[PDB]
Amino acid sequence: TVSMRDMLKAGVHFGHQTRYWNPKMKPFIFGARNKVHIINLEKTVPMFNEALAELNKIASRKGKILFVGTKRAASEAVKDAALSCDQFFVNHRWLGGMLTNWKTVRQSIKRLKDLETQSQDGTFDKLTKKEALMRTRELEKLENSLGGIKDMGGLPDALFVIDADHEHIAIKEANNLGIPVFAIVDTNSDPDGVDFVIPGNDDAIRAVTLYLGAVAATVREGRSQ
Amino acid sequence: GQKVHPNGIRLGIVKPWNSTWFANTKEFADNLDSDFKVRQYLTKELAKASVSRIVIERPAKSIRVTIHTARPGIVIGKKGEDVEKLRKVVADIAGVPAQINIAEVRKPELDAKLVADSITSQLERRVMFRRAMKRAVQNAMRLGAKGIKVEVSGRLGGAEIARTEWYREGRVPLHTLRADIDYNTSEAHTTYGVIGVKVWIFKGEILG
Amino acid sequence: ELQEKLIAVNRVSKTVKGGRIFSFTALTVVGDGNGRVGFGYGKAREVPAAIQKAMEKARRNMINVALNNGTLQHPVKGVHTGSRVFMQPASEGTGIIAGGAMRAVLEVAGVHNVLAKAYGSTNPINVVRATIDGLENMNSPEMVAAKRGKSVEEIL
RNA sequence: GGCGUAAAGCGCACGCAGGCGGUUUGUUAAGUCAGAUGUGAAAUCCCCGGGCUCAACCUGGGAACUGCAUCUGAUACUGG
RNA sequence: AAGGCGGCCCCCUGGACGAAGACUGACGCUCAGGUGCGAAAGCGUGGGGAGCAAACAGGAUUAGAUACCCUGGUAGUCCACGCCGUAAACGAUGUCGACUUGGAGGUUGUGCCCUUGAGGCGUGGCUUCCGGAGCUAACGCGUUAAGUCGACCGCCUGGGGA
RNA sequence: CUGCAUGGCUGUCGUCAGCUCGUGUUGUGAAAUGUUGGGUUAAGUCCCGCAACGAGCGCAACCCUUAUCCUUUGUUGCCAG
Ligand SMILES: [Mg+2]
Ligand SMILES: [Mg+2]
Ligand SMILES: [Mg+2]
Ligand SMILES: [Mg+2]
Ligand SMILES: [Mg+2]
Ligand SMILES: [Mg+2]
Ligand SMILES: [Mg+2]
Ligand SMILES: [Mg+2]
Ligand SMILES: [Mg+2]
Ligand SMILES: [Mg+2]
Ligand SMILES: [Mg+2]
Ligand SMILES: [Mg+2]
Ligand SMILES: [Mg+2]
Ligand SMILES: [Mg+2]
Ligand SMILES: [Mg+2]
Ligand SMILES: [Mg+2]
Ligand SMILES: [Mg+2]
Ligand SMILES: [Mg+2]
Ligand SMILES: [Mg+2]
Ligand SMILES: [Mg+2]
Ligand SMILES: [Mg+2]
Ligand SMILES: [Mg+2]
Ligand SMILES: [Mg+2]
Ligand SMILES: [Mg+2]
Ligand SMILES: [Mg+2]
Ligand SMILES: [Mg+2]
Ligand SMILES: [Mg+2]
Ligand SMILES: [Mg+2]
Ligand SMILES: [Mg+2]
Ligand SMILES: [Mg+2]
Ligand SMILES: [Mg+2]
Ligand SMILES: [Mg+2]
Ligand SMILES: [Mg+2]
Ligand SMILES: [Mg+2]
Ligand SMILES: [Mg+2]
Ligand SMILES: [Mg+2]
Structure with missing residues (x-):
């Protein structure tokens, strides 16, 4: 569906130098x-x-x-x-073991959900505000890492x-x-x-x-x- | 030689004393002897009963013994038969009029003295200590404990070299002062010696 | 339906500042009574945890072995790191003539008539690896017929 | 079966005997392969049977004795 | 070829490699025994002898110090001709040949493009490092193999004793 | 009598910041990773990075006391007016 001069315009034919190449790409x-x-x-x-x-x-x-x-x-x-x-x-x-150790990553999917529940919908105001910032940067980090699979539930195909x-x-x-x-x-x-x-x-x-x-x-x- | 007793360290914060009375120095050690003799007597009589905590309180020169036990049916018997048998000997020991109340122990798998005495009775009837420690942990974590640690010590399986073993499931913070750590210790008098059993149970933090 | 055999248990050690820490290793092999065989090697402070980790890893990482009726298809050799291993198809009902770990792996492999010999080191881990490599690279008349591009009858 | 480090590559090299030897054709038939004949004592071992009440044992026939010699052939390979 | 070889010049002399051709036509590989070469130390005869330096002497150090340290210092080290024939004489890896993904260099030739600069594109020899498959007990080796094969030789068979 | 048959209790390294596990992955394996690295801290304290992700005992806090203030109650305590 993409022509060759389409690829040549986007820059698909470019690659790396001749001292970094894999001999399997011959x-x-x-x-x-x-x-x-x-x-x-x-x-x-x-x-x-x-x-x-x-x-x-x-x-x-x-x-x-x-x-x-x-x-x-x-x-x-x-x-x-x-x-x-x-x-x-x-x-x-x-993350190392995101697929193989899915059963462990699942407990951080659940933690990212419970922190999102608590803060946006849950309104998890009224905590120790230093913990409110430790919860904040934990939830920011977990959304920054595991947000793309938080609705996946099982292994991808x-x-x-x-x-x-x-x-x-x-x-x-x-x-x-x-x-x-x-x-x-x-x-x-x-x-x-x-x-x-x-x-x-x-x-x-x-x-x-x-x-x-x-x-x-x-x-x-x-x-x- | 390292660890403080978690009850005695928690006695001002989240744990209550098992004797709550007042006396001056003249009648202090006499009341405390009377409390010792009645806890001795009640433990020997209700040994088969799964008794955990004998609370003693004496207002107005009248002793009140509150027995916490997992089953009150074997402690009472008929309605005022064995309780009255133990009451007249409590009044004989204390020298004052007595009163016995019985508080039932919900969830006997979550009480350290009951678990330790069940392990001791099992070791006395010669079961494998690891199986007893497994069943105590699985039953307590099933019944809902946030963390249990058990530990046996000495002359295990009749071995001449005494060693200690301990299992742990869940978090048991001993240094956390507001943690509700139920701790108690039993002893099994086997034919090869004495096996000591300790059990810590963490239910959670009291937010006073 | 997957028959499971532990071959050997072994106590290992690890010296630290306090002293020696002991641990246990377990070598188990599973199989379906047919070509599906798989081994595992677990290790823990305690023996039932080590056998359970070994059976857990053995139930996955299964391997498929193209058997004949109840025996092998051609005399095959297998090596791994100390253990050159020879095994040979045999007549009906001569039994599993095999040593140590190879008896357990061929019994759960569902073979019943072999003539085996373990040369070299007879460490059960490497000899069970050498048998898994021998049974895995044992090839059928169908696979060689499709490979050479002839019929089975042209192969005899 | 091995020889870097576990035992084990001569300190290096030339080189006689010895071992091995590119490619093509022709020829030989020595090696090699096939067949036949003679022999390879009997017993023994093995197979199929027979006989002692069974077995051990005894025994009939066969196969085998994987070898050697001679002859008739074959010519891919090795040798000449 | 190994041991080994270090100012410069000359004389004699061995080997390697490259480029085009021409020529002989398997004349080749390995090698027991054998022969030859073979560091330093050492030996013999004759020289030479500055420095260094076994031995030895003195001083210190030390419990002692036939040592380390210091001040000296003789064979020896040097040359000629012979002998010895050994080293962790090591790449601890026998020689010859063939095949098997790569990368960065070093050195030494040589071909081509307009050398439009000391560049651009190749093609041979030797060499260093990393590393893939594969191999290996592992460490690691890895087109200069410890990979895959062939030919010949040498050697090993528990540690001492030896 | 036996602390070298034991329980319990206690000293000690040491209030030192360390010790481990689960699953995953690597290695034939003993094991390793995590727990290492860059900073930082009293601290394996925290942040970032990372074939690790998590968790537990401990590192801290929760306890007592002292240090300032407020309210309540003022005798057997107090004395500004
Ligand atoms: Mg203390
Ligand atoms: Mg593994
Ligand atoms: Mg062996
Ligand atoms: Mg060998
Ligand atoms: Mg050596
Ligand atoms: Mg050696
Ligand atoms: Mg050599
Ligand atoms: Mg030829
Ligand atoms: Mg011929
Ligand atoms: Mg012939
Ligand atoms: Mg013939
Ligand atoms: Mg005969
Ligand atoms: Mg018969
Ligand atoms: Mg010929
Ligand atoms: Mg010619
Ligand atoms: Mg020779
Ligand atoms: Mg000399
Ligand atoms: Mg001389
Ligand atoms: Mg002289
Ligand atoms: Mg002189
Ligand atoms: Mg000197
Ligand atoms: Mg030598
Ligand atoms: Mg060298
Ligand atoms: Mg050598
Ligand atoms: Mg030669
Ligand atoms: Mg390399
Ligand atoms: Mg090889
Ligand atoms: Mg080679
Ligand atoms: Mg080797
Ligand atoms: Mg002691
Ligand atoms: Mg003691
Ligand atoms: Mg792990
Ligand atoms: Mg550490
Ligand atoms: Mg760091
Ligand atoms: Mg921490
Ligand atoms: Mg603390």
Whole structure:
């Protein structure tokens, strides 16, 4: 649904230098310009559309989707995409064991809810005001970390990651839990732990917004369908 | 040789004294001997009864013994039969007119003296101490205790090397002064020696 | 329906300022009476907690073994770190001729007729890893037929 | 089965005997492979049976004795 | 080749590598025994001898101090020719060949582009570090393998005794 | 008699700021992480970061006393008018 010169305009073909690249990306690199590899958008387009087709299958049948990017550049874009398709997001640090130790993270989901109940609706005025500020910065921290999954309740069914090494931990937890992985795999990453590899740049805000808007699209289209 | 007695340290804050009377120095130690002899007698008689706390109070030269027990049916018997049997010997010991009231112990699994005596009776009839400590903790945390710690000590399974063991479930803040820590201690006189049992139960903080 | 066997318990230690702290390790293996086998290794201050952690990890991380009727399919070898292990398919009702940890893992594996031999170190953890690797890489006539792109009858 | 550190690479090298040897064709048939014949004593072991009331035991037939020799062939491999 | 080799000049001399071609046509690899080389210390004969310095002497230190420290100081260290034939003689890793993802350098050639600068693109030899698969008891090795294989040789078989 | 058969109680390191667990992950494993790092504090005190997330005993506070004020009651206490 996205053409090659669309990707070339957003900056998907860019990548990293030739002293940081993974030799597993040899079947995805077109050439090398200015001592920088170039991502073959000829193989990017049909793989990104195969990923969006499987995304349209799962979000058609109301699978749970978790968007994972904490690059401090796609944090707002991955939030706006997960609130577009009312899916779940991780914009700040992936906690170690967020999926595997779900039964422990659940007790902080409940703590974030009870603190939100107490302060907005609960009007949890009338405490020791030093505790009212310790409750405030706890609830701010927990909403800043676990707010994107606070309505998820169970394990998600597919994980879409912007960078396979900035978020390599979530890859391992999904590989353990059998959850399929959709990922924007740059030249400096390992394409083995990812079930659906999408070559492309990772730091470009236009390309991250292109990827996320195309996923929040084929999910909203599969939900409405 | 380290820890203070949590009742005696909580006696001014959240715990009441088990004897609440007044006397001058002339009749103080005599009243306190009479209280000791009656707690001795009532414990020997109501040993099979799950008695926890004998509260003694004497207004106007008339002793009033309030027995807290988990079952009053075995302490009373028929209506004024065994209570009256114990009342006439209380009045014999104290030398004053007596009065016996019985306060029922709701939830006997949440009372340290009852748990410690159940463990002691189990160890006396030769059960595994770890099973007894498990059942005391599971029953207390089920019945709603915010935290229990049990501890046995010495000659466990007839071993010649005495060691101590302790279990803990929930939070038991001993240094928190407003914590309602029910603490008591029993002793099992086995054929291999004496096994000491301690039990702390934290129900929660009194916000006075 | 998943039969469960503990192989060996062991007391380990950890020396600290106060002295020696003892702990217990438990090596358990589970299986469904068929190719689904899985082992676990738990450790705690107490033996029932260690067996329960071991059975917990063993019930997951199960592995699938393409068995024959009740025996293996070809003479397979397995190694892990001290334990070269040979095992061989055998005739009907000759029993499980196997040593120590391998008897428990093949019994919950649902095999019934093997000829095994554990060379090298017979540490139960590494030899049960070597048997899991041998049964996992044992391959069927169907898998080799689809692999070579021929029929089973062309393979014989 | 091993040889960095647990026992174990000569201090290094040249090099005779010895071991091994790229690729193609032709030829040989030595090795090799197949078949046949002779032999490989009997007993023993094994198989199928028979006989002592059963068994041990005794025993019939067979297979086996994985070997060697000669001859007839084969020529991929190794050798010439 | 190892041991090892450090001002500069000359004489004699060995080896390596590169570029195009030309040529011989398997002439090759390894190697018991054997032969040769083989640090320092040491030995022999003949020289030489500044410094350093075993030994030794004196002074201190110390309970003692046949030591460390100090002041001296002889063989020796140096040269020629012989002998010895050993070292933690170590990469504690035998030689030869083949294949197997990468990255940053160092050194030494060489080809091409307009060298439009000391650049840009390659292609050989040697070498250092990190590290992937794989291997390994682990530590770690990791295209210069301790990975995957082939050929030949040497060696090991509990610690002492030895 | 046996404190070297024991309970209980007590000293001590030491009112030192430390000691651990659950699940998760790493390692064949003993174990590790957490509990480390950057700052900071009396303090494993707090903040940030982090394959850890949490929790417990302890670090603190809750107790008593002293230090200022207010209200109430003034004898056996007080004496400004
Ligand atoms: Mg004290
Ligand atoms: Mg594990
Ligand atoms: Mg062995
Ligand atoms: Mg060996
Ligand atoms: Mg050694
Ligand atoms: Mg050695
Ligand atoms: Mg060598
Ligand atoms: Mg040949
Ligand atoms: Mg021939
Ligand atoms: Mg022939
Ligand atoms: Mg023949
Ligand atoms: Mg014969
Ligand atoms: Mg017969
Ligand atoms: Mg020939
Ligand atoms: Mg020619
Ligand atoms: Mg030789
Ligand atoms: Mg010399
Ligand atoms: Mg000399
Ligand atoms: Mg001389
Ligand atoms: Mg001189
Ligand atoms: Mg000197
Ligand atoms: Mg030597
Ligand atoms: Mg060296
Ligand atoms: Mg050597
Ligand atoms: Mg040679
Ligand atoms: Mg390396
Ligand atoms: Mg090998
Ligand atoms: Mg090698
Ligand atoms: Mg090795
Ligand atoms: Mg003592
Ligand atoms: Mg004592
Ligand atoms: Mg843990
Ligand atoms: Mg610590
Ligand atoms: Mg720090
Ligand atoms: Mg704290
Ligand atoms: Mg305190």
